[PDB]
Design a binder for these strands. Structure first.
Ligand SMILES: [Mg+2]
Ligand SMILES: [Mg+2]
Length: 958
RNA sequence: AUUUCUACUGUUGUAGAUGAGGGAUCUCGCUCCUGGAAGAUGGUGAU
RNA sequence: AUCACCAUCUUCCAGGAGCGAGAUCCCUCCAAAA
RNA sequence: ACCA
């Protein structure tokens, strides 16, 4: 479909020849080397109008509710300060320069601080409830005496603990500390955090005010920082091409004036295996700065002339008429003065801009940029030394790994673009791929943690890196988002959604997000929907013509020895067994050997679904088992974090102890865990005798026990973290228990239990069972959270969570291209709209959920094709899910969202039936998922796609 | 062994992904500095 | 036997700054002729 | 919707 301009930041390496922190920044265009700060006059005068507040309108900035007395008290407290003619602001901003101003955020902080100061003194000193009710602490007043006593019991207990600790000796001191920290201080803090209603409400109100202020604080901070970021340009840059390779020349502005003049006299003499390029261009965004930029001061010499062309002054004169603006700009280019100082190609502009007529301003911008962008070329004998002599030019070599290897046709995309920029054909499209006129250089020190311990390596020595920005699709409409109001982004999305047409779409992808399979994919086409069921079943059965072809590894332990005697395993890197050259080179085998190995090790089949947990693209084939290590790394990082966050990390020693286990031993531990898993309601109501049968139900094999209807009545309704915890489960679980007593006798105070790891089958192909030794070294009580630095422990889960998404986006894009080059039309990506309420629950249950990251990476992927609009504030548009509506659909470009109700069990053909088991509908229709889907778990994704398609077309009917 | 990340890894390096810099608000874990309160212990003064 | 004070010491609370993890968010990345 |  029709695209729009897109930007990316690509970088290379530089090798110095003649001479992180910004060592240098440069601009190819010679006329942006003396920049001046942007004209933000409007926004500065507009944001002050949002800062100012009128006292009486404060309480309507929040959803919270305060009684009238508290409202009056707060207003009185603020008025106490607003005397002497001060004016109130939503916050303090030293950059705008306001004075005699009073910050509301500071006052809200102070009235909270003073009261939390007085309340502690009152509670500590030993006053009474009636004394409290007579104080001026209007926030803490009116608490139930029950809470007051609940708090003072802990206070006095703590008091006791204090003097106990002072006269301490020996290991006793360790058992005291924990009892002081773990149970008393934390419980007391939570009591006041989550039970004092007015306190909670005021905390929420202050939070909302603080966030609101922070927004328009960040905006203004960026506005100010732009004023100083734009003074660091000093160099004019050139690219000297030779023998098919580029150099990089930086020349200071002290000499650019003479250097360009000298270069202008060079003779263009074809190709001699050496060229000295230099860029020139003008843009619409710069003409407005030229004409209506800083006009109020009157020193804009471009407005000492040209005024006759004006209607009165200032860009606001045009009132917003596109065709008056177009004509004024054409006249500006038509003026005698403008052509005397500008450097545009007068002939082509005159024959193609001034004389023409444009339908809209977008085309005027496109034509101006298209015709004003030039890439010159000159050549002369040994043209390197004159620069070093006359102009003191610094010189680097631009390089990278892909720019030095023998074979080509297999090269990284970010190098593909740079290779494609210089092609001759690209000069005849008017530079569709554009290299923007500003670039930067950075210098990185070596890692001492690598030097000391140490075989080529990046980090073993310093590096010079070049960062450049490249704009693809330079001849399509532009789109920018700075300073748009929140209500304009939604309108932008709605307008951009109009491009799609009802009969344009031809298929859809449905994606399901579980927790045993982190995600699942399925494909739907309109051809599946025949009239009779007998036709639907047959249409589905033709898997050979619809589904896609996938390879499955047959033996994950297979290994082979290469010529060096080293051994290699298939699981770690299958790409050394699928590609031909790699196998024949490394293992020195013959053609027949390769054919036999390929025919014996890998199975292949065509299906309608998949399982994105481990699928990967290897040498053009989709391997369903090509990415086990990336899943193991995630299931290991989750456990390593969990077993480190349940310790304690105070400086002073403590006796908290924790251990790993395969099963729980003492009934205290089982009773603690069962409580950790169940809902507080329907559990505390559970009889103290049945709390043992519940443990037997959770932790035994369920085969030798005669559990009655109680299981459905009670056990299955109070469980909120589902799973299988038996000893013979498919993926046996591995536990961590925490206590203090030395030997864990049958009567000990265990005060935490959790389930850490899942022993997924086929993890043993990488690591033996004993490699829980790895899961432990990352837990240690003595460690202080402040001390722990990177490169000795790593708690990050972001990278290991982006790895799986990186492997899944490849599969999804490959399938999208495959089907689009067969059906002739674009398709929709459908996933259910959980919103924000359920995303947090999903994170809680596992903490490695991939939903939001996968969505945020699909948006990044599919923008390049021009299929979703630019995104500014994602939470603005949705902020929530789609519930209780089985027809609605939320659309961002080609990415849809729907309600997930009743999708995971309905039969694709019979609808009314339910298909939780046997892979055949109980209604006895012809449906049978044996030869279609990888398992019975894919039926959700299919449905997720199905409902995604039918609804979308339904939206276009009117 | 990489502009950068992940799995490998040296007879041409291999398979997937890649928009980077600086900053704002909030939640959780910790440390140093200054101030307030409760209190343990040796000593000194006093009625 | 009681009351005031000096000094070492324990805990909790408030404010300032810094480190580690997660969530939401923002701006910059093309201008000038004497 | 997440799951012996
Ligand atoms: Mg689902
Ligand atoms: Mg699922």
């Amino acid at each position: 479909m029709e695209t729009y301009k897109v930007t990316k930041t690509i970088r290379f390496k530089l090798e110095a020849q003649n001479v992180g922190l910004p060592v240098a920044k440069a601009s190819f265009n010679y006329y942006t080397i003396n920049k001046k700060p942007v004209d933000f006059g409007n926004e500065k005068s507009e944001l002050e109008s949002r800062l100012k507040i009128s006292i009486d309108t404060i309480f309507k900035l929040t959803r919270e509710n305060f009684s009238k007395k508290i409202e009056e008290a707060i207003t009185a407290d603020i008025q106490k300060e607003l005397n002497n003619g001060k004016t109130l602001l939503l916050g303090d901003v030293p950059m705008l320069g306001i004075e005699n101003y009073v910050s509301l955020r500071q006052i809200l902080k102070n009235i909270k601080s003073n009261q939390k100061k007085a309340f502690s003194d009152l509670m500590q000193s030993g006053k009474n409830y009636n004394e409290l009710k007579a104080t001026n602490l209007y926030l803490l007043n009116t608490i139930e005496q029950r809470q007051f006593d609940n708090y003072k019991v802990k206070t006095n207990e703590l008091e006791k603990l204090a003097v106990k600790i002072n006269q301490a000796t020996n290991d006793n001191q360790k058992k005291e500390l924990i009892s002081n920290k773990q149970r008393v201080a934390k419980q007391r803090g939570i009591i006041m955090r989550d039970n004092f209603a007015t306190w909670k409400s005021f905390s929420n109100f202050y939070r909302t005010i603080s966030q609101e202020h922070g927004k328009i604080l960040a905006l203004l901070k960026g506005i100010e920082k732009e004023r100083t970021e734009s003074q660091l340009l000093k160099y004019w840059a050139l690219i000297l091409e030779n023998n098919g390779q580029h150099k990089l020349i930086l020349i200071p502005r002290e000499k650019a004036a003479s250097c360009k003049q000298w270069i202008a006299s060079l003779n263009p003499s074809g190709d001699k295996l050496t060229k000295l390029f230099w860029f020139e261009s003008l843009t619409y965004r710069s003409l407005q700065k030229l004409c209506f930029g800083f006009t109020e001061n009157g020193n804009n010499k471009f407005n000492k002339n040209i005024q006759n062309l004006l209607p009165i002054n200032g860009e606001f004169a045009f009132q917003g008429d596109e065709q008056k603006k177009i004509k004024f700009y054409q006249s500006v280019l038509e003026s005698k003065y403008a052509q005397s100082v500008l450097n545009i190609p007068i002939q082509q502009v005159q024959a193609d801009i001034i004389n023409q007529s444009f339908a809209s301003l977008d085309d005027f911008q496109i034509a101006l940029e298209k015709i004003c962008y030039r890439l010159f070329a000159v050549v002369e004998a040994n043209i390197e030394a004159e620069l070093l002599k006359n102009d003191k030019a610094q010189i680097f070599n631009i390089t990278s790994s892909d720019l030095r290897k023998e074979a080509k046709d297999k090269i990284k995309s970010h190098t593909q673009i740079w290779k494609a920029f210089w092609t001759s054909e690209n000069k005849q499209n008017n530079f569709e791929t554009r290299l923007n006129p500003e670039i930067t250089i950075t210098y990185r020190q070596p890692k001492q943690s690598k030097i000391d311990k140490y075989k080529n390596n990046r980090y073993l020595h310093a590096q010079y890196t070049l960062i450049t920005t490249i704009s693809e699709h330079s001849n399509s409409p532009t789109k920018i988002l700075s300073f748009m109001s929140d209500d304009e982004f939604k309108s932008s999305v709605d307008t951009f959604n109009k491009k799609f047409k009802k009969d344009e779409i031809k298929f859809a992808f449905g994606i399901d997000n579980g927790e045993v399979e982190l995600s699942t994919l399925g494909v739907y086409f309109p051809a599946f929907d025949k009239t009779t069921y007998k036709e639907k079943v047959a249409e589905l059965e033709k898997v050979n013509d619809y589904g896609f072809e996938v390879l499955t590894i047959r033996n994950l332990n297979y290994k082979e020895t290469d010529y060096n005697g080293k051994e290699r395993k298939i699981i770690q890197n299958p790409s050394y067994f699928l590609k031909k050259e790699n196998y024949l080179r490394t293992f020195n085998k013959s053609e027949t050997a390769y054919q036999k190995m390929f025919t014996e090790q890998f199975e292949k089949k065509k299906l309608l679904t998949l399982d994105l947990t481990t699928a990967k693209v290897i040498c053009g084939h989709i391997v369903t088992n090509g990415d086990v290590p990336a899943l193991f790394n995630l299931w290991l990082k989750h456990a390593q974090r969990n077993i480190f966050e349940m310790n304690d990390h105070i400086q002073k020693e403590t006796a908290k102890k924790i251990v790993l286990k395969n099963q729980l031993d003492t009934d205290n531990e089982k009773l603690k865990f069962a409580e950790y898993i169940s809902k507080e309601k329907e559990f505390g109501k559970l009889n103290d005798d049945e709390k043992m049968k519940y443990t037997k139900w959770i932790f035994e094999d369920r085969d030798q026990n005669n559990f009655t209807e109680v299981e459905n009545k009670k056990f299955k309704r109070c469980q909120k973290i589902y799973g299988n915890y038996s000893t013979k489960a498919k993926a046996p679980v591995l536990f961590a228990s925490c206590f203090i007593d030395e030997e864990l006798q049958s009567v000990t105070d265990i005060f935490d239990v959790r389930h850490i790891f899942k022993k997924r089958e086929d993890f043993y192909a990488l690591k033996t069972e004993e490699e829980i030794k790895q899961l432990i070294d990352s837990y240690n009580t003595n460690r202080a959270s402040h001390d722990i630095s990177n490169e000795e422990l790593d708690l990050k889960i972001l990278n290991t969570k982006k790895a799986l998404v990186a492997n899944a986006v490849g599969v999804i894009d490959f399938l999208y291209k495959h089907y689009e080059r067969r059906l002739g039309g674009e398709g929709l990506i459908i996933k259910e709209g959980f919103g924000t309420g359920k995303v947090e629950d999903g994170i809680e249950k596992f903490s490695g959920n991939i939903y939001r990251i996968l969505e945020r990476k699909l948006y990044q992927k599919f923008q390049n094709y021009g299929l979703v609009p630019p995104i500014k504030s994602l939470m603005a548009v949705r902020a929530n899910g789609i519930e209780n509506n089985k027809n609605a659909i939320l659309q961002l470009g080609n990415v849809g969202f729907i309600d997930p109700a009743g999708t995971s069990q309905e039969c694709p053909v019979c609808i009314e039936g339910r298909l939780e088991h046997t892979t055949t509908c109980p209604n006895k229709c012809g449906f049978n998922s044996e030869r279609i889907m990888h398992s019975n778990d894919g039926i959700a994704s299919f449905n997720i796609a199905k409902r995604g398609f039918n609804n979308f077309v339904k939206s276009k009917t009117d």
